[PDB]
Design a protein around this motif. Structure first.
Motif, PDB file in Angstrom:
ATOM      1  N   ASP A  67       0.828  -1.191   0.000  1.00  0.00           N
ATOM      2  CA  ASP A  67       0.000   0.000   0.000  1.00  0.00           C
ATOM      3  C   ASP A  67       0.873   1.255   0.000  1.00  0.00           C
ATOM      4  O   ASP A  67       2.101   1.215   0.256  1.00  0.00           O
ATOM      5  N   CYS A  68       0.212   2.363  -0.276  1.00  0.00           N
ATOM      6  CA  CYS A  68       0.884   3.646  -0.424  1.00  0.00           C
ATOM      7  C   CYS A  68       1.516   4.133   0.877  1.00  0.00           C
ATOM      8  O   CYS A  68       2.507   4.862   0.838  1.00  0.00           O
TER       9      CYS A  68
ATOM     10  N   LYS B 292      -0.121   6.023   8.888  1.00  0.00           N
ATOM     11  CA  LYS B 292      -1.455   5.559   9.075  1.00  0.00           C
ATOM     12  C   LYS B 292      -2.031   6.225  10.287  1.00  0.00           C
ATOM     13  O   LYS B 292      -3.172   6.611  10.247  1.00  0.00           O
TER      14      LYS B 292
ATOM     15  N   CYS C 245      -3.071   8.242  -2.707  1.00  0.00           N
ATOM     16  CA  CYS C 245      -1.650   7.874  -2.788  1.00  0.00           C
ATOM     17  C   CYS C 245      -0.753   9.065  -3.039  1.00  0.00           C
ATOM     18  O   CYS C 245       0.348   9.149  -2.495  1.00  0.00           O
TER      19      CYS C 245
END
Length: 88
Positions: free
Chosen positions: A2-3, A19, A72
């Motif tokens: 993931d980005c 995150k 992103c």
């Protein structure tokens, strides 16, 4: 990957940190502008990047629409800003 993982890897930031910022700032929600800050600026997209950075970003072909609606891009721009000594 993931980005958050890609971005964390690039800028040596724990992906969980990115995150946790996304969660705190937008609850990992893309596509939203904050209400306008007291200083008249405003925060954009998943990591809530301040509008004061749009000028710098235009040199690199990153628009406001990109930051707002492309998670992103938003995430990678936040990584760059946090990793530099630009005030976030």
């Amino acid at each position: 990957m993931d980005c958050f993982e890609i971005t964390g890897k690039a800028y040596n930031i724990d992906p969980l940190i990115l995150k946790a910022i996304a969660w705190n700032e937008s609850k990992n929600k893309n596509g939203i502008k904050s209400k306008i800050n007291k200083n008249g600026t405003y925060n954009i997209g998943i990591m809530q990047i301040n509008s004061s950075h749009l000028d710098l970003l235009s040199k690199f072909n990153i628009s406001e629409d990109d930051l707002l609606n492309d998670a992103c891009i938003n995430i990678s721009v936040a990584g760059y800003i946090l990793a530099s000594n630009i005030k976030y």
